Amino acid sequence: ARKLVEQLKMEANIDRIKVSKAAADLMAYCEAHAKEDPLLTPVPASENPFR
Amino acid sequence: TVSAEDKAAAERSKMIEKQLQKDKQVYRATHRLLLLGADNSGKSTIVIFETKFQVDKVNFHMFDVGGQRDERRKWIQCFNDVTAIIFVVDSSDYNRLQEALNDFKSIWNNRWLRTISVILFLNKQDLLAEKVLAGKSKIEDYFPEFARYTTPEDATPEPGEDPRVTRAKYFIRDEFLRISTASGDGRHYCYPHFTCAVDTENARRIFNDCRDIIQRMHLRQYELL
Amino acid sequence: TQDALYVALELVIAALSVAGNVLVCAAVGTANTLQTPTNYFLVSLAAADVAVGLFAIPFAITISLGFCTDFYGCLFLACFVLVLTQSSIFSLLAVAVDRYLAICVPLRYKSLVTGTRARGVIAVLWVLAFGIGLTPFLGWNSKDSALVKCLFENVVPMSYMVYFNFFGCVLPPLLIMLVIYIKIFLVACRQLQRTELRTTLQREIHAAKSLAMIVGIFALCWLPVHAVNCVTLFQPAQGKNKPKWAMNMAILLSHANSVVNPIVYAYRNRDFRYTFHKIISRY
Amino acid sequence: DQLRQEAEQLKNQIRDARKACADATLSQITNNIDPVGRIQMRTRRTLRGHLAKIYAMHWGTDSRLLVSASQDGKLIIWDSYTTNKVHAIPLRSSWVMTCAYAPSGNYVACGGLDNICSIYNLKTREGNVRVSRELAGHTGYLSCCRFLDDNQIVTSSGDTTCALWDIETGQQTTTFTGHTGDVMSLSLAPDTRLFVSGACDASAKLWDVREGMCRQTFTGHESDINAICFFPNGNAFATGSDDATCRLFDLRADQELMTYSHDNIICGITSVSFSKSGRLLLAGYDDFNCNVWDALKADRAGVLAGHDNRVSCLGVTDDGMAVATGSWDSFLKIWN
Ligand SMILES: CCNC(=O)[C@H]1O[C@@H](n2cnc3c(N)ncnc32)[C@H](O)[C@@H]1O
């Protein structure tokens, strides 16, 4: 339809960033919260509410 | 270390469990059936979304889903434990018949319904009889292979009818049985019937063939069939 | 010589029975899919079999050895053996009737068999077995005839086993099982005649072979003991002089049922095989 | 036609623009991190009481209660600490496929094949759970509904459109109709500003709440899409398909980043979830077991094989202490 071609217009002008920066941000977020993830590093049984 | 709150919680849980036991008792002893058809098939007047009925002190549930569209492959995964699937097919319209056969193929070949039996209801036989008695029938035009067909010897025509109507009537059943015979054996079968609009014996037929399906499954479970 | 063979074979039978019958109970307990109303009768049968293999046999050699003790310290062992052996026959009848009910009454099977009714039936079966077994203590003994030599015939008379434990505790179950397993065969033959129209005969022979062994094993295992008892009771001329090991062979055949029950009833079903395969593969 | 030529030109423009921004592959830049290792999880509690197959499960904000729905037509509210049952709400339709728990903890939601979304109020005054509102605007079967606040809700159905509903007025405010097939998954951003949708067209789209316009689309799958979830940072999302693959997408790059798959897996994906740190991906499968994947290395970590039928649902608490798994055996399992 005449609206479908119009829709594709705003899907092309959005600025796009290199994948390297996104990967670096993802790595930083993953490594900045590693000590508060009980599943990855199990907590001692004293503080575990599922025993 | 149990306080009053824990005791109240335990009492509430016990009441809930008792109600659940009653619900399980009333639920596990009923049978479920799913009805399928197309528009103008007359699927709403064989006995609307749900229906309960009992025969010989045995319960039966009837389900119908019609708010969807032609594609149904997504919500058919839920109905993997139904006892049987009822299929209603019209026979008055010759043009809108081949399409119906296609709708029968997928149901017979769907991977989620590999162990589910199907009960066929060829509806509107009076209309077919009147149409074929009159001279405006053109069955050969809509189906080229009808010319060579002859009535099977195993057929049991009802006394007091034209031979032409019984020939045309069994012709339609032939192609519906052909699909069942081509694929699938030992897990599910078809049970043909000739249902009219005024017939009142449908419940007995469903009782009889559902009993056969259940008996066959139970015989197969002990590995002696 | 003969006694050594008898006791050794009894010990071997007890060991095999306990080893085979612990597995069925463990599998039923540890599997959620096998917690069905049908499997409760099977687990009751397995429990009766393992209890027999753990208690009845050693008591049997204790009785048959021929040592001296008090009169009432021997009847207790005899009655315990009788109770433990009768429970197995009652469980076999229960599983037979459960099997018949599903096939010959298909639509009303679910509404008639529930956990509550199955538990009640099992409790009644065990209570009736205990009641039948302990009847001699009520006064059906041989004290007036006769510190006391422990032989099975000295404590409990032959007027009890033939008339009460055979004519009212063994034969009617066999007749009921025969009727049930003939009717099921007829139903299966009709359903195959309808199906066909391999060959029909090659699938009829398989069903006949499968249904025949259940009754044949029971008939081979239980009849000879009571046949010998009837021979002893009725005609004394033949009964008085017979080889000793003839009675021992009957005892062995009667106690050999505990190792053949799980193979016929439990290991053949598909659900048990699937659960065993999954457990073996995982472990 | 001229219109199709313009569409082809625009599609090629989009393709080359996407190709231009590709800097480096993830494998070359992930080859220096320390591997997670082997993760072993054991079942702690098994919750029984359901009759039929179980189709949905949602946790709460306090990581204390959960809600379960089954084909028997009943909602159960549990307490995972002591395996109690706080409430059991009967339903009007036996067919249900959606559940939701309000962040404030006063409301629950349900929906199914009856084309109507039902809202139930929990903290009442008379002591009985009473239905508050019913929404009946869609024309297809609902697939998933998630709350935004105490007075707004978002729903997706088989009518190839998604909708936003305001509870008090009862009339929807904005509908999104860019899709061409059955939409059957959606997840919300942590800041409650955008949300993603996955359709039956092997495609996913990201929508804006107040704008009401599709802002960015992603494709690459070859079959149906069954589940989708949001990364904790709000800048990525992972999707699962019937091609037995999981695919990770970034929003700022408009491109694929990672693909998790193996040659020994043939069944389909039915549920996907993330962890608190974003280092772990949990995926339920069709072969009676779940799997754990490393989001930055594309390697297996462990198998949570403890079920006997399909594992339909999957959830992770806000604090990440436990993982809940439902199945078609009418059983729920809690792992830690
Ligand atoms: C329910 C019937 N049970 C028995 O016959 C058991 O009793 C024992 N038994 C019965 N009659 C005799 C006998 N005459 N001598 C030794 N044991 C016997 C057998 O070992 C059987 O296992």
UniProtKB/Swiss-Prot annotation, chain B:
Q: Which BP terms does GO give this entry?
A: activation of adenylate cyclase activity; adenylate cyclase-activating adrenergic receptor signaling pathway; adenylate cyclase-activating dopamine receptor signaling pathway; adenylate cyclase-activating G protein-coupled receptor signaling pathway; bone development; cellular response to catecholamine stimulus; cellular response to glucagon stimulus; cellular response to prostaglandin E stimulus
Q: Name one Pfam family in it.
A: G-alpha
Example GO CC term: the record gives:
trans-Golgi network membrane
Do you know which SMART domains this protein is assigned to? G_alpha (SM00275)
- Signal peptide segment: none
> What ranges does the record give for the region G3 motif, renumbered to this chain?
60-69
Q: Where does Mg(2+) bind?
A: 44
Keyword annotations for this protein, in alphabetical order, are: ADP-ribosylation, Cell membrane, Cushing syndrome, Disease variant, Dwarfism, GTP-binding, Hydrolase, Isopeptide bond, Lipoprotein, Magnesium, Membrane, Metal-binding, Nucleotide-binding, Obesity, Palmitate, Phosphoprotein, Proto-oncogene, Transducer, Ubl conjugation
Query: Membrane topology type, per the record?
Result: Lipid-anchor
Describe what happens upon changing residue 91 to R.
In AHO; may alter guanine nucleotide binding which could lead to thermolability and impaired function
Please state the pathology the record ties to this protein: Albright hereditary osteodystrophy: A disorder characterized by short stature, obesity, round facies, brachydactyly and subcutaneous calcification. It is often associated with pseudohypoparathyoidism, hypocalcemia and elevated PTH levels.
Main role?
A: Guanine nucleotide-binding proteins (G proteins) function as transducers in numerous signaling pathways controlled by G protein-coupled receptors (GPCRs). The alpha chain contains the guanine nucleotide binding site and alternates between an active, GTP-bound state and an inactive, GDP-bound state. Signaling by an activated GPCR promotes GDP release and GTP binding. The alpha subunit has a low GTPase activity that converts bound GTP to GDP, thereby terminating the signal. Both GDP release and GTP hydrolysis are modulated by numerous regulatory proteins.
Q: From what organism does this protein derive?
A: Homo sapiens (Human)
Curated annotation (Swiss-Prot), chain C:
Sequence ranges on the Extracellular membrane side:
64-74, 235-242
The record's PROSITE patterns line, in alphabetical order, gives: G_PROTEIN_RECEP_F1_1 (PS00237), G_PROTEIN_RECEP_F1_2 (PS50262)
Q: Which GO terms describe its cellular component?
A: glutamatergic synapse; plasma membrane; presynapse; Schaffer collateral - CA1 synapse
Q: What would be an example GO MF term here? A: G protein-coupled adenosine receptor activity
Q: What subcellular compartments does it reside in? A: Cell membrane
Signal peptide location in the record?
A: none
SS bonds (residue pairs): 74-150
> InterPro entries recorded for this chain?
Adeno_A2B_rcpt, Adenosn_rcpt, GPCR_Rhodpsn, GPCR_Rhodpsn_7TM
List the ranges whose topology is Cytoplasmic: 30-39, 98-117, 183-210
Give the way it sits in the membrane: Multi-pass membrane protein
UniProt-listed Pfam families: 7tm_1 (PF00001)
Please state which protein family the record places this protein in.
Belongs to the G-protein coupled receptor 1 family.
Function, as annotated, reads:
Receptor for adenosine. The activity of this receptor is mediated by G proteins which activate adenylyl cyclase.
Its protein name is Adenosine receptor A2b
Swiss-Prot record, chain D:
Q: Which GO terms describe its molecular function?
A: GTPase activity; GTPase binding; protein-containing complex binding; signaling receptor complex adaptor activity
Q: How is it modified after translation?
A: Phosphorylation at His-262 by NDKB contributes to G protein activation by increasing the high energetic phosphate transfer onto GDP.
The biological processes this protein is annotated with in GO are: adenylate cyclase-activating dopamine receptor signaling pathway; cell population proliferation; cellular response to catecholamine stimulus; cellular response to prostaglandin E stimulus; G protein-coupled acetylcholine receptor signaling pathway; G protein-coupled receptor signaling pathway; phospholipase C-activating G protein-coupled receptor signaling pathway; Ras protein signal transduction
Question: What superkingdom does the record give?
Answer: Eukaryota
Residues with the Phosphohistidine modification: 262
The UniProt keyword set, sorted, is:
Acetylation, Disease variant, Host-virus interaction, Intellectual disability, Phosphoprotein, Repeat, Transducer, WD repeat
What this chain does, per the record?
Guanine nucleotide-binding proteins (G proteins) are involved as a modulator or transducer in various transmembrane signaling systems. The beta and gamma chains are required for the GTPase activity, for replacement of GDP by GTP, and for G protein-effector interaction.
By what name is this protein known? Guanine nucleotide-binding protein G(I)/G(S)/G(T) subunit beta-1
Q: Which gene encodes it?
A: GNB1
